[PDB]
Amino acid sequence: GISSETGEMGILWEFDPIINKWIRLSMKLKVERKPFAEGALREAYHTVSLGVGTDENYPLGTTTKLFPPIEMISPISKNNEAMTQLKNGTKFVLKLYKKQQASRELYFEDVKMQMVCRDWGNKFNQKKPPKKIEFLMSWVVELIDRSPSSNGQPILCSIEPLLVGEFKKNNSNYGAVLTNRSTPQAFSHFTYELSNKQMIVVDIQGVDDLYTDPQIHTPDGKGFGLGNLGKAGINKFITTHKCNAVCALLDLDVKLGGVLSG
Ligand SMILES: Nc1ncnc2c1ncn2[C@@H]1O[C@H](CO)[C@@H](O)[C@H]1O
Numbered sequence: 001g002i003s004s005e006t007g008e009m010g011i012l013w014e015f016d017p018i019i020n021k022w023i024r025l026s027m028k029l030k031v032e033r034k035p036f037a038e039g040a041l042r043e044a045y046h047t048v049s050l051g052v053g054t055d056e057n058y059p060l061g062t063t064t065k066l067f068p069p070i071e072m073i074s075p076i077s078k079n080n081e082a083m084t085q086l087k088n089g090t091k092f093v094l095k096l097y098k099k100q101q102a103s104r105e106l107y108f109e110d111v112k113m114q115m116v117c118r119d120w121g122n123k124f125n126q127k128k129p130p131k132k133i134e135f136l137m138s139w140v141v142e143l144i145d146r147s148p149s150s151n152g153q154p155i156l157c158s159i160e161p162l163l164v165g166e167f168k169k170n171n172s173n174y175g176a177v178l179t180n181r182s183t184p185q186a187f188s189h190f191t192y193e194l195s196n197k198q199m200i201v202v203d204i205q206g207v208d209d210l211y212t213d214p215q216i217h218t219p220d221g222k223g224f225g226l227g228n229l230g231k232a233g234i235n236k237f238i239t240t241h242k243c244n245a246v247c248a249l250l251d252l253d254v255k256l257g258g259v260l261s262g
């Protein structure tokens with residue numbers, strides 16, 4: 001339930017890969033004035049939840065140029081991760097694009113991308129590796145109380161749980177290997193091999209195998225946001241990848257093998 005305390009309203013979107021649908025909710029939140037960190041394109045803000053509710057007050061309207069399209073939206077939203085993970089009082093992180101080559105579609109793609117990587121994390125863990133991994137939930141929020149931009153586009157953001165500890169990036173989306181840890185690189189290799197080269201998960205970053213904001217490359221280069229560099233991204237990973245003990249333990253081929261022709 002949404003608290004009566006002072007904060008701003010949002011439409012909250014959760015993607016559920018197993019039913020292949022978005023779940024639409026509302027929430028109230030209070031976000032700090034200044035960001036605590038920044039990346040290339042976005043800034044991160046500390047936020048507290050003032051509760052999660054239904055989307056009943058905020059009708060979608062007609063389905064012509066609705067994103068996501070109505071057929072991708074669950075009619076029912078009684079069950080979801082948000083109602084426990086974003087319950088009243090929860091401290092979490094909000095990310096906003098600075099200064100904006102970001103369509104509406106991009107916010108949803110990026111969050112769906114994180115949910116897909118979250119599935120890959122569970123698949124990896126089922127092999128009983130020495131260190132289990134996990135990707136945080138992420139959500140799209142339409143900050144509906146904020147006045148639209150120069151164009152009548154609502155203000156959009158993504159939100160995710162707060163990581164406590166030293167945040168480290170382990171690889172980039174274009175071949176950088178940034179720490180000496182084995183598990184992040186083995187996981188990237190695992191995703192390439194076990195997907196039959198349909199995709200790779202890189203930008204493996206977070207605190208101690210609790211990861212967030214990954215990026216996927218696919219051979220055809222379609223979908224998965226603007227950070228999908230296609231075969232180029234896959235090949236760049238291969239040039240710098242050196243199999244380690246976790247790769248061996250997972251019985252991964254030391255020969256990675258070529259990209260798919262489109
Ligand atoms: N979920 C999160 N929890 C805490 N810090 C984060 C989170 N996501 C991103 N960051 C911070 O923002 C930076 C990204 O530029 C990271 O280096 C990290 O310091």
Ligand SMILES: [Zn+2]
Pocket residue numbers: 185186189241242243244247252
């Ligand atoms: Zn390897």
